[PDB]
Homo-oligomer: A and B are copies of this chain.
Amino acid sequence: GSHMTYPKYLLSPETIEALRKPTFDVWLWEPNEMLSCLEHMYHDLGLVRDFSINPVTLRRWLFCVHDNYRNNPFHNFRHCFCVAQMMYSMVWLCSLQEKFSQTDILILMTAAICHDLDHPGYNNTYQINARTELAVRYNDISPLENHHCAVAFQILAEPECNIFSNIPPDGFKQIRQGMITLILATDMARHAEIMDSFKEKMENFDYSNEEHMTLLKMILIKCCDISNEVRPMEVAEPWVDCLLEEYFMQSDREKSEGLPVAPFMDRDKVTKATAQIGFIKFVLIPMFETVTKLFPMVEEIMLQPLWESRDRYEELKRIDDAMKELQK
C-alpha cells in the first residue's frame, strides 16, 4: 500500500497489525523478519520504555537467541517465534495489561522466547533413558527445560545481549525467578499437576494472590507453547508433520540403541489425525476451557478453531482408516 518498496526487515503496517492476532501466518517469514517482529513486540508492549532496554541491545539479544536455536524440524527458532507471537496475541486478546504488571509481561514474553533454547530434537524421556550428559547433569529433573533456562541466562550474561542491564538487582532477581518457573513449567510431564493446581485456584481465583498469578502465567506459557492447533488450519497442520519428523528421528534411534519407544513416536502406531484428535480433546480443549472462565473471549478466538480442527482430523481419520483397509 506504500509509495515505494522497503526491505523485508522493515515490517509493513499490515504486518504489524496482523501480528497482534492468532491468525498470523508464521510460515511466511524468514528469520530476519521474525526477528523484527519480536523486536517490535518489545517496543509495542512498552517494555523497552519501562525497563530502559538499549534498543541495539534488544536486537543483539534476539540475534543471539536465534543463533542458539537449533535447526530441528520442530524445536527451532520459528517455533519459539510462534510461542512468542501467541503470547503477544493473548496479551491483546485477554487485555493482560489490565491484569498484569509490566514485569509480569516482561517475564511472559522473555520466557516464551527463551523456553526451548538449544533443544536437541530428542525429548526428556530420550535423555533420561539414554543417560545423556544432560540427564546426568540435571538428575533426570526436567533436563531440557533446565538447560533451556540456563542457556537463557548464559546469553543474558553477555553484556552486549543484556536487555536487563538497566534493571535494578531486585527487579532482575524477580524476573529471573519468574522466567525459571515459567520455562520449567513447559515440561509436559507436569501438565496434569499444573492443571490440577490451577483449577484448584480457579475454585475462587484472586488476581492479587501472587500464587494464583504464578499459576496463571505457567498456564499462559503452556497455552502458547502447545497452541499450534489454535491457528488457521493451513498454518497449524504443517507443524504436526515437523513434530512427527522429530519424533521419528528419536524412536529410530531408540530402537537402534535398544531403548523404549513411545507409541506416539512409533511409525507403526501413530497417525497425525489420531494423535491430534487425542491431544485436542484431552489436553488443549480442557486447558483453554479453564482459561475461558477468566477470559471469556478466548472461547471464540481459540476454542472455536480447536473444535474445527478436531472435526477435520476426524474426517481425515475416516480416510486414513480406509486407506489401511486396502493394505493387508
Binds B, one of A66-74, A131-139, A297-305: A131-139
Which residues on B sit within 8 Å (CB–CB) of A141?
180
| Chain B CB within 8 A of A242 CB | no
Which secondary structure characterizes the binding site on chain A? helix
- A112 interface residue (CB < 8 Å to B): no
Cross-interface CB contact of A150 among B137, B153, B177, B180, cutoff 8 Å = B137
Tally of contact residues, A, Cβ under 8 A? 17
Interface assignment of A157: CB less than 8 Å from any CB of chain B: yes
Residue of B nearest to A259 (CB): B169
Given B140, B154, B176, B184, which contacts A176 in the complex, CB threshold below 8 Å?
Answer: B140
B140 touches A177 (CB 8 A): yes
Would you call A82 an interface residue if the criterion is a C-beta within 8 Å of the partner chain's C-beta atoms? no
- Inside 8 A of A150's CB, which chain B residues have their CB? 136-139
Q: In the docked arrangement, what's the CA distance between A177 and B137, Å?
A: 14
Q: Name A93-150 residues within 8 Å CB distance of B.
A: 131, 136-141, 146, 149-150
Whole-angstrom distance from the CB of A196 to the nearest CB of chain B? 18
Residues 44-75 of chain A, each 1 if its beta carbon lies under 8 Å from chain B, else 0: 00000000000000000000000000000000
How distant is A155 from chain B, measured CB to nearest CB, in Å? Answer: 10
Chain A positions 153 through 168: 1 when the CB is less than 8 Å from some CB of chain B, otherwise 0: 1100100000000000
Contact A131 B146 (CB under 8 A): no
Could you tell me which residues of chain A, from 6 to 35, have a CB within 8 Å of some CB in chain B?
A: none
Chain B: minimal CB distance from A132 (Å): 10
Contact assessment for B146 and A138 in the assembled complex, using a CB-CB cutoff below 8 Å = yes
Q: Name the residue among A139, A153, A184 with the largest chain B CB count within 10 angstroms.
A: A139
Distance of A108 from chain B, by nearest CB (Å): 17
A136, A150, A184: most-surrounded residue (chain B CB, <10 A): A136
Give the nearest-CB partner of A154 in chain B: B136
Known A-B contacts A131-B157, A157-B131; A146 and B139 likewise in contact (beta carbons under 8 Å)? yes
Docked Cα-Cα span, A250 to B327, in Å, equals 71
CB-defined contacts of A154 to chain B, threshold 8 Å: 136
* Closest chain B residue to A145, Cβ basis: B139
A139 touches which one: B131, B139, B180 (CB < 8 A)? B180
**Smallest Cβ distance from A109 to chain B, in angstroms?**
19
CB distance from A293 to the nearest CB of B (A): 31
CA distance A211 to B180 in the complex (A): 28
User: 10 closest pairs, A vs B, by CB?
Assistant: A139-B180, A136-B153, A139-B149, A137-B150, A136-B150, A139-B146, A136-B154, A139-B150, A140-B180, A131-B157
Q: Which residues of A are interface residues toward B (Cβ below 8 A)?
A: 131, 136-141, 146, 149-150, 153-154, 157, 176-177, 180, 184
Apart from A136-B154, A139-B153, 5 more pairs, CB < 8 Å: A131-B153, A137-B137, A138-B138, A139-B149, A141-B180
**A to B CB contacts below 8 Å, 21 in the list:** A131-B153, A131-B157, A136-B150, A136-B153, A136-B154, A136-B157, A137-B137, A137-B150, A138-B138, A138-B146, A138-B150, A139-B146, A139-B149, A139-B150, A139-B153, A139-B180, A139-B184, A140-B176, A140-B177, A140-B180, A141-B180
